[PDB]
Amino acid sequence: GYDRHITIFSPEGRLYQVEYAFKATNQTNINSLAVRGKDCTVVISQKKVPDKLLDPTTVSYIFCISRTIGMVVNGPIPDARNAALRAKAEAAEFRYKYGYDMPCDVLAKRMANLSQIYTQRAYMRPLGVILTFVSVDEELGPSIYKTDPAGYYVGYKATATGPKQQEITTNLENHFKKSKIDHINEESWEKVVEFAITHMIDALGTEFSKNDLEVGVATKDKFFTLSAENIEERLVAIAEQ
Amino acid sequence: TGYDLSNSVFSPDGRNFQVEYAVKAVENGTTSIGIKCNDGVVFAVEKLITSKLLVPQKNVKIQVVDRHIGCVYSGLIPDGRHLVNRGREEAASFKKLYKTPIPIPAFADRLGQYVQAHTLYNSVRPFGVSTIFGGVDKNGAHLYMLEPSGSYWGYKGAATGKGRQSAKAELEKLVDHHPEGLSAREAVKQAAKIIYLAHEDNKEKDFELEISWCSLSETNGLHKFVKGDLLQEAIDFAQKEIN
Amino acid sequence: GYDRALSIFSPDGHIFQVEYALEAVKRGTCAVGVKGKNCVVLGCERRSTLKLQDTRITPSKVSKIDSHVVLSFSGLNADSRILIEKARVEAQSHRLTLEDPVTVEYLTRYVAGVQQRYTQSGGVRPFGVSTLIAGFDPRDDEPKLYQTEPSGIYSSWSAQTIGRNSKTVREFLEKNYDRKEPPATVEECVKLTVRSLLEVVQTGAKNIEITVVKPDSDIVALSSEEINQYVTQIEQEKQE
Amino acid sequence: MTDRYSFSLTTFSPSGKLGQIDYALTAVKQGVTSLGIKATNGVVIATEKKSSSPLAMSETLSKVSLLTPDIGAVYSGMGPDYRVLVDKSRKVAHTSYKRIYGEYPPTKLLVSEVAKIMQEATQSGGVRPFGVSLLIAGHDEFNGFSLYQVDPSGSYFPWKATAIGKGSVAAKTFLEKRWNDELELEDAIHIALLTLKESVEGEFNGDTIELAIIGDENPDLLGYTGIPTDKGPRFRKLTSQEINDRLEAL
Amino acid sequence: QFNPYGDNGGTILGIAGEDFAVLAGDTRNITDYSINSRYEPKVFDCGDNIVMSANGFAADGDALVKRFKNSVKWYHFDHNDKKLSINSAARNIQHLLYGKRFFPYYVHTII
Amino acid sequence: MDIILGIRVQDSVILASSKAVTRGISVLKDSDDKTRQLSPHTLMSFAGEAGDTVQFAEYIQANIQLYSIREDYELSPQAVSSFVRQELAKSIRSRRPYQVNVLIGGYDKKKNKPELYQIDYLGTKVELPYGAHGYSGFYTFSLLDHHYRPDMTTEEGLDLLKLCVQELEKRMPMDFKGVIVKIVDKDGIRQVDDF
Amino acid sequence: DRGVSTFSPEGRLFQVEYSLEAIKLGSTAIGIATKEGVVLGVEKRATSPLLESDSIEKIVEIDRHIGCAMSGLTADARSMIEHARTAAVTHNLYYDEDINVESLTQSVCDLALRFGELMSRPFGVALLIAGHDADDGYQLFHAEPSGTFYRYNAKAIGSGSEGAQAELLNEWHSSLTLKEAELLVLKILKQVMEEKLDENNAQLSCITKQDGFKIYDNEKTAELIKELKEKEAAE
Amino acid sequence: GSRRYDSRTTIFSPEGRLYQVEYALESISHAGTAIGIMASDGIVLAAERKVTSTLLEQDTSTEKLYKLNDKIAVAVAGLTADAEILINTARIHAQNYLKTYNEDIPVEILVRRLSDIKQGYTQHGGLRPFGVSFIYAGYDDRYGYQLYTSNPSGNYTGWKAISVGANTSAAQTLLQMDYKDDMKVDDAIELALKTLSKTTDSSALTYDRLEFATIRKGANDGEVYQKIFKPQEIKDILVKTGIT
Amino acid sequence: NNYDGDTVTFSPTGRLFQVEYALEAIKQGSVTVGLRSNTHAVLVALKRNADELSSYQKKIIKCDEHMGLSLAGLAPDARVLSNYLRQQCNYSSLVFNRKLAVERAGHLLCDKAQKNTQSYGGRPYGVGLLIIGYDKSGAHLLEFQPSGNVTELYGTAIGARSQGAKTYLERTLDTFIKIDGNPDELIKAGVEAISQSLRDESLTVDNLSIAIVGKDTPFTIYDGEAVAKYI
Numbered sequence A: 001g002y003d004r005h006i007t008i009f010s011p012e013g014r015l016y017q018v019e020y021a022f023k024a025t026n027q028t029n030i031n032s033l034a035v036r037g038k039d040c041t042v043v044i045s046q047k048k049v050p051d052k053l054l055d056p057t058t059v060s061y062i063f064c065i066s067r068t069i070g071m072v073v074n075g076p077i078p079d080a081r082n083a084a085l086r087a088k089a090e091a092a093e094f095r096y097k098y099g100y101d102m103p104c105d106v107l108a109k110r111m112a113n114l115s116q117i118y119t120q121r122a123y124m125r126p127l128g129v130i131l132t133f134v135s136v137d138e139e140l141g142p143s144i145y146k147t148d149p150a151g152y153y154v155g156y157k158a159t160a161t162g163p164k165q166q167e168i169t170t171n172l173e174n175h176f177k178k179s180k181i182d183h184i185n186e187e188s189w190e191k192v193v194e195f196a197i198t199h200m201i202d203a204l205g206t207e208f209s210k211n212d213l214e215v216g217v218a219t220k221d222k223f224f225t226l227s228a229e230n231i232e233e234r235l236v237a238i239a240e241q
Numbered sequence B: 001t002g003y004d005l006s007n008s009v010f011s012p013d014g015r016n017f018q019v020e021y022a023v024k025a026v027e028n029g030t031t032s033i034g035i036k037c038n039d040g041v042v043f044a045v046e047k048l049i050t051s052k053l054l055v056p057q058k059n060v061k062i063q064v065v066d067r068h069i070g071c072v073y074s075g076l077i078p079d080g081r082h083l084v085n086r087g088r089e090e091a092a093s094f095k096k097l098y099k100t101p102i103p104i105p106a107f108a109d110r111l112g113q114y115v116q117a118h119t120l121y122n123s124v125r126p127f128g129v130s131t132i133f134g135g136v137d138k139n140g141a142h143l144y145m146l147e148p149s150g151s152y153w154g155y156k157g158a159a160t161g162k163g164r165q166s167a168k169a170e171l172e173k174l175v176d177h178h179p180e181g182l183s184a185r186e187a188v189k190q191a192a193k194i195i196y197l198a199h200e201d202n203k204e205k206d207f208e209l210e211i212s213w214c215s216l217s218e219t220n221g222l223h224k225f226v227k228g229d230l231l232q233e234a235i236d237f238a239q240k241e242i243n
Numbered sequence C: 001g002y003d004r005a006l007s008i009f010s011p012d013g014h015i016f017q018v019e020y021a022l023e024a025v026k027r028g029t030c031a032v033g034v035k036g037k038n039c040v041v042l043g044c045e046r047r048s049t050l051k052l053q054d055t056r057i058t059p060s061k062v063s064k065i066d067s068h069v070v071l072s073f074s075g076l077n078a079d080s081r082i083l084i085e086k087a088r089v090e091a092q093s094h095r096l097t098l099e100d101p102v103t104v105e106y107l108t109r110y111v112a113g114v115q116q117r118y119t120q121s122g123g124v125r126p127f128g129v130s131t132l133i134a135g136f137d138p139r140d141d142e143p144k145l146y147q148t149e150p151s152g153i154y155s156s157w158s159a160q161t162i163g164r165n166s167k168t169v170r171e172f173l174e175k176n177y178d179r180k181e182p183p184a185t186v187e188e189c190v191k192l193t194v195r196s197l198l199e200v201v202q203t204g205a206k207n208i209e210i211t212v213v214k215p216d217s218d219i220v221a222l223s224s225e226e227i228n229q230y231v232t233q234i235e236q237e238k239q240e
Numbered sequence D: 001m002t003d004r005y006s007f008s009l010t011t012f013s014p015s016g017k018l019g020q021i022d023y024a025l026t027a028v029k030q031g032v033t034s035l036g037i038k039a040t041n042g043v044v045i046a047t048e049k050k051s052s053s054p055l056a057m058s059e060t061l062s063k064v065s066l067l068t069p070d071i072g073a074v075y076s077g078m079g080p081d082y083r084v085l086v087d088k089s090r091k092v093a094h095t096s097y098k099r100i101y102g103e104y105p106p107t108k109l110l111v112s113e114v115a116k117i118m119q120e121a122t123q124s125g126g127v128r129p130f131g132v133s134l135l136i137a138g139h140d141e142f143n144g145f146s147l148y149q150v151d152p153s154g155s156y157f158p159w160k161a162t163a164i165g166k167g168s169v170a171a172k173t174f175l176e177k178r179w180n181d182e183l184e185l186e187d188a189i190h191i192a193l194l195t196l197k198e199s200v201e202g203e204f205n206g207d208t209i210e211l212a213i214i215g216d217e218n219p220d221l222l223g224y225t226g227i228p229t230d231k232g233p234r235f236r237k238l239t240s241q242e243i244n245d246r247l248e249a250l
Numbered sequence E: 001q002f003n004p005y006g007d008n009g010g011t012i013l014g015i016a017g018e019d020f021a022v023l024a025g026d027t028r029n030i031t032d033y034s035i036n037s038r039y040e041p042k043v044f045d046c047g048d049n050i051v052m053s054a055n056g057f058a059a060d061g062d063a064l065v066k067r068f069k070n071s072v073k074w075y076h077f078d079h080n081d082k083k084l085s086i087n088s089a090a091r092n093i094q095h096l097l098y099g100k101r102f103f104p105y106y107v108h109t110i111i
Numbered sequence F: 001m002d003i004i005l006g007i008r009v010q011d012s013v014i015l016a017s018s019k020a021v022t023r024g025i026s027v028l029k030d031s032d033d034k035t036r037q038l039s040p041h042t043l044m045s046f047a048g049e050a051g052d053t054v055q056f057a058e059y060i061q062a063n064i065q066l067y068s069i070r071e072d073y074e075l076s077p078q079a080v081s082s083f084v085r086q087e088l089a090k091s092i093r094s095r096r097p098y099q100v101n102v103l104i105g106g107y108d109k110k111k112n113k114p115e116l117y118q119i120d121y122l123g124t125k126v127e128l129p130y131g132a133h134g135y136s137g138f139y140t141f142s143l144l145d146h147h148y149r150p151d152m153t154t155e156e157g158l159d160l161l162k163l164c165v166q167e168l169e170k171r172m173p174m175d176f177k178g179v180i181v182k183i184v185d186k187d188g189i190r191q192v193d194d195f
Numbered sequence G: 001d002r003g004v005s006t007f008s009p010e011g012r013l014f015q016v017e018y019s020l021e022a023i024k025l026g027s028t029a030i031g032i033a034t035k036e037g038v039v040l041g042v043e044k045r046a047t048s049p050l051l052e053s054d055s056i057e058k059i060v061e062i063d064r065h066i067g068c069a070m071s072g073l074t075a076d077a078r079s080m081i082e083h084a085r086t087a088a089v090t091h092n093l094y095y096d097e098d099i100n101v102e103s104l105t106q107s108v109c110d111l112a113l114r115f116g117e118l119m120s121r122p123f124g125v126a127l128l129i130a131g132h133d134a135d136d137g138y139q140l141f142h143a144e145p146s147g148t149f150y151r152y153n154a155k156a157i158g159s160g161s162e163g164a165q166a167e168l169l170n171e172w173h174s175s176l177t178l179k180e181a182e183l184l185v186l187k188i189l190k191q192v193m194e195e196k197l198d199e200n201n202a203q204l205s206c207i208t209k210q211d212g213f214k215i216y217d218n219e220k221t222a223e224l225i226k227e228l229k230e231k232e233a234a235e
Numbered sequence H: 001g002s003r004r005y006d007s008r009t010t011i012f013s014p015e016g017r018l019y020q021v022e023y024a025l026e027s028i029s030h031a032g033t034a035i036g037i038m039a040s041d042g043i044v045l046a047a048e049r050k051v052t053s054t055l056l057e058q059d060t061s062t063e064k065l066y067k068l069n070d071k072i073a074v075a076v077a078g079l080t081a082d083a084e085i086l087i088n089t090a091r092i093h094a095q096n097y098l099k100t101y102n103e104d105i106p107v108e109i110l111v112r113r114l115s116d117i118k119q120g121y122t123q124h125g126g127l128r129p130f131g132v133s134f135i136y137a138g139y140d141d142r143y144g145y146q147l148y149t150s151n152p153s154g155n156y157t158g159w160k161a162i163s164v165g166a167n168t169s170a171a172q173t174l175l176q177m178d179y180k181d182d183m184k185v186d187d188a189i190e191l192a193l194k195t196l197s198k199t200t201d202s203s204a205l206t207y208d209r210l211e212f213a214t215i216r217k218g219a220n221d222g223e224v225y226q227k228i229f230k231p232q233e234i235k236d237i238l239v240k241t242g243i244t
Numbered sequence I: 001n002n003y004d005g006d007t008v009t010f011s012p013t014g015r016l017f018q019v020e021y022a023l024e025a026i027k028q029g030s031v032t033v034g035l036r037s038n039t040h041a042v043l044v045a046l047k048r049n050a051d052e053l054s055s056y057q058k059k060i061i062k063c064d065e066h067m068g069l070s071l072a073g074l075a076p077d078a079r080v081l082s083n084y085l086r087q088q089c090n091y092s093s094l095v096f097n098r099k100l101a102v103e104r105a106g107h108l109l110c111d112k113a114q115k116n117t118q119s120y121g122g123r124p125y126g127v128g129l130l131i132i133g134y135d136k137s138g139a140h141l142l143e144f145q146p147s148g149n150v151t152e153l154y155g156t157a158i159g160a161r162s163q164g165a166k167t168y169l170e171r172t173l174d175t176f177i178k179i180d181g182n183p184d185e186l187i188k189a190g191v192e193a194i195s196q197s198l199r200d201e202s203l204t205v206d207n208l209s210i211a212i213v214g215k216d217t218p219f220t221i222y223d224g225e226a227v228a229k230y231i
């Protein structure tokens, strides 16, 4: 059964290598979440540093692709960094060729096309990663676009990824049923981050210290990650309410 | 099955068994360590003396990249040399285009992407080495450890090879007992002790100690080998601790 | 580029792809070559499971490589066209640089070399073809008949046959061909060639092709009636 | 390194089947239903928007795509494969036709180019076939309106009306009863919506249905005025509101 | 426009006897009207009892001698330390020179 | 090289080509045959740059002979002329073009008609009742405009040709050492030995 | 299947070892080196009586001072001979001298391992290269598809090799004349050949400093065959 | 490496057959039947469409019969996509010849080159062969009217009458029975349709499941005309011979 | 077993079987010994024949005036690697006017062998080499294995029954290292070393092969009657 080793069709029209790349996605055992505000897009991800000998500042699955675009990865770090370097290069080339910053959705499509090629071409394996791209697009506003090893991609009102993704997904669904809107009706990004952490706490059922989380924020004209003390400041605000 | 016969093939778990098999080659190799200190890094390695006929001090294993980065590795020694040769090419082209010597995090990703590339195709074999490396740049000291999968992180202390667990335990004590920081000269002494302690896991053949270091104050930010009086002083410190 | 080594040695020291190419030759229609005192005759079998054929336009079994040399074959028909084309090109190239047409030995050596190259080149299979190459060297009246095969070996023959049931017609030729006295005339040579094919063919109707090559670029193909006269004559002498 | 797969991954089996093509067609069968109907004064193509998550914005994912101003495409099967085929199809319309003749290709020839691309994925080295069937609707001056289906093998056929994917067998039978050669475009849209309701299970509205037409020229969608010969695209994507209007008088 | 050739002057002379041969050359090296060196040798022992000088443009002269010396070295490696005869050296040098027929070594060579 | 002429009459094409090969101030040869038989009923004469001429002629000859063997059939003069034209048309935009002018005289056996084609090194083809390359045309064209008739015999064509050679031998600056004359008709190609 | 350049667990290349089996199936070739010259002889082995034996060419000239005999898949030898001839002539062009026999052999052996995934498989033919040069005198080399070559005083290759080699072990001494070597090749060929040895199914050749490489006529070999039969009956 | 997944498309069986070529011919034997009949004054091409649907657009359709140039056409049996690759190559080859020699390409030359391309895919490159068999119908001034066939092996042969695709065995026997040399085009039209009608796997032969074409000298004086039949013209010719 | 089809495949315990099989070809090869003092470095090699009619396969190859090696295993692979060393030594001389350090020679061989162990299609080299030389840091002896591993030693031996000589040299270490300014005695020690690897056969005149390089001695090889002194 060599149809399970390379990306050719099985008798039932399936690509097993693509399906097994999806299972590599959860190898890190980390859950990520993304939501949109009025002015911003917030992405949060768990940060697990098991080894005491590790330098915790170098352990990260959130990447600054361009000034405006951020990307969080669910999957092993080697493939994650491979995807990040390619995205950075593509975004840079786009700006040089076409004279404006690459939109989040266009980068998502491009990376999705690259992933599609690996599902069709035999010599290249799929990357075992799911890429969530976030920005505040100058035309479309707050944006979340997500890519997988099948080459699929779509925009999101909000999204979650990881082993316990379904619990987070329904938690978010139930909120948007209640609020009756496509986003978090909030002025500052600080409170949108607080919303994101609050609803992750409810869905996962765990408490977080400052070193258990990782936060990326996209505003108009810049995407940035938060420090431990920025997150701690955010955790204190949630606790005092 | 047969999923483990070819590199770059995902198993039903989502694993690349060929990379995990390369890790077994690394675990079979001699012990090597890295200690991050106040203003730099220290590297040390175990050299098994197979025979009396080996010339002492003349089979050097630690390798320099550029003038500010040191690299040591465990596993298939030739594979490590191939990786360092690439590292030297990467560092040269960086300095060529950008003038400044390659930063350690930048250098770390160059090796990482290269090793990761050797997990993408069935026409190549994964690297049979884990590489501990680092140095001093504009932002201070950095220590890294890179594995066959292409995975790397920054480290306060790092260890790999046959005596990695013994060395890791000893490294964790130093991190706990010295929260403010360890000095360069202290880290050299500690490196000797840890290699001697990690040698208990490879104690048939006796061994030869080899240490190197990069420090902003002690070596002026450049990679140097520890030799002569400073080496013998570090050996004596280690000898006193095992007894 | 496709690189795979398809022709390789096996534990017993055989190259199976070359040997399987010989099986394709064994499947092909029978071809025979007989050289006389002043001529060479090439006879060829044509299978009769194909009626409604158009013999005007259907590719002939014997091909002119130059005006003085001919090539017949047994095996894969499509494969033979490639060899014939290359041979025809080399024939014109030789005339261009040496200012003299090819010798039959040289043309044979070239065709055999091509066949050999396809036995140790990556990405290619051997030619499923054995050839009979006959003619006369420039300004020479000594008849020449050569044989090649997929492996690339070639040699000269007083008379030879290839293709299906070739071992039967070779048996016939081995006792009916005298080295001390080859067929003295054209008629004698054609008759011996037709006789040898009649051991294997079936009917002497539109199943046998005969091509006679004489010195100084004198090549002609016999028609049905002309061949049928040999068939009629041989059968009447047989009833004895 | 380098692509060592220079050999075919689709080959003939002893029975004469081309396995990978058959398996690609199986993937198309699993895919969501899409259809096309040809009227006297237009063509309609439609499909269901299967949402992956309710948090996902299904507007950002377009299953019906413009190829040229007068040609549109829809599919059944693997979405990513379709997306890259649309990219390649749009480009080939320019490189192999518009940059040569200064006008857009007729439907049949653009279809022919897409078919070629899909045939090569069936024979070339180190690749699998595309896991999609396309329905391409279009108009051109000398052939009028036309509708084509393209399969993973690279084969294409012209249709009066047809359906592909999940419930194509039932949908084709439904279309045989309703189709005549006197259908007006509005009648064809009505029949398209009726046919699609049978295969759709959940919500059936303008947000879950994607539908486009090839009809009259749209000067308002051209973006400029002043050139009399340029009269606008015949391809138009029906809005969510426009679909719901027709679902009341259903 | 850049001119890749120059003239370094000097002169050389070879005479053969019955059981010996001499190859002489002055040690002066010049460009235009200036002296570069009063002692810059251009007659070299190339091994196997062959002496060589390539006079004219010194850069080409040095390159040629360098290549021939190297040719002698590889002749030993490839032919079981066989002595390179003077006639064989001569033919070898012809191919070194003609190899740059369309961008010549600007020298007159004597061995 | 230098002088090549061609005349098409009722039943044949006649080609006349100068015998001299001159290099510098020396006539190296006075019996040079500036022609190649491309096929049994097709003949090509040539003139131009030294080396190029024979190299081109023989290259064309090889290709037509290759075609004849492959198809067991003779290409028409029109078909051969078009092949030659295209080869020259390619050549003119090459790194080093063939500087060769040719005349192609042939008898079409299917039409039972003689045909003469004039092709220059640029790949400029024309079918003509009479043709010339180089400075020859400056004398012969006007001469033939006057004396040529379309219904002439081969013998009349040879006399018409003698008139051209006589004029060239009178008014041309260079000694071209006479001409070799060849006739192309239904029976193939033959050389006139006494001219 | 498996790689073409794969090692066996015993440290040998599969394909090279398999090509050696092909050579064992080949017709016999014998060479003997003396101080008066080197003799090369081969078994022709016609597959059928209708085949004109004189067209069987298993002894071949490389240069005036170097000859060659073959055994195995003889079609494979054509490009080896072509390379050898070019190497010999090219060296004469570059150095105005005869190329050493050992250097020629080394050049041919460089082709041997140039196979893999270069040609698709090793050569299936072994060569006996015999010649003379001023430095090392008369020489005989055995060139294999492994890329290895040994100098020999005498050597047999092909189907009857191991039996013929044992015979050469006893018969060879350092004072053999050329005539003695000629008879010895005929004698040993007649012993290992299937069909009865005569001038039509066997061929002799030699290389001498004075006359160079020469293939003998069928008339000349026939007399040596007659001289051989008479001498064996004479005691 | 990638050796593991190589099918080795261009190798011999132990019996000396080419696996992939044999399997391609097996594929072709399930395709719709196509017949070619050569008469003294023209050629007929007749082909059966593969099981049609009533909603298929019949008039603006082309599946079996393709025009290569003004004097040559082909009937297809096998994968249509594969056939179009080869047809475009053949169309280009015809124009190359016309550009080079200023004469329309002789039929055999075009057939040989297309067949040589097929041969190449069986000997080198490691790719699957083209799953296509052609019937070539054409005219030139050397041999006049000619019928050829080629198959995935790259082997081609000339015919007076021939069938490819499904039920060739039964079709060939029927053609061999009723064919004679002095036959006219209109008789050949009738023979072609009668043969398909008896060999068809369908219930009854109708206009919508057929493609038809003739190559006559039935233009005005010494020139050849290609007639690709329209739906209504096939309907009429089917009535005229009394099949429907 | 299932993991020895090519060099690009690791076994479940992290072994490269094709490299190990290449290592096995060296063990079948004839014994060769290397040893050095502070002034000289010596190679001694036992040559092997096909039979009594054949020559003895040459084991020692010169790379430069100051460097050379001995071989054990596939001889054609030694020819490829020695040729590469000749070029590298030569590149160092032409470009930098610098004699190639014996240590760099080892690093270059390591990296060349390594590339053949990580790519599809290729194969490992099937030969082991003992490289001796005298450079700016005195006498050197290196051991090359086709795995890529190169090792600097006072003395060593590779090939069949090399363990006997390797043990002897391990005992004699203190003696032979101080044989300075005396070539004949250093060779005698090497000839006595290789004698510990002999079985049923003894060292004859066309069997023994010796090479030496040192302070005032270019790399030279001794064969035939020139080694009769040491028997």
Ligand SMILES: [Cl-]
Pocket: A109, A110, A113, A114
């Ligand atoms: Cl893209």
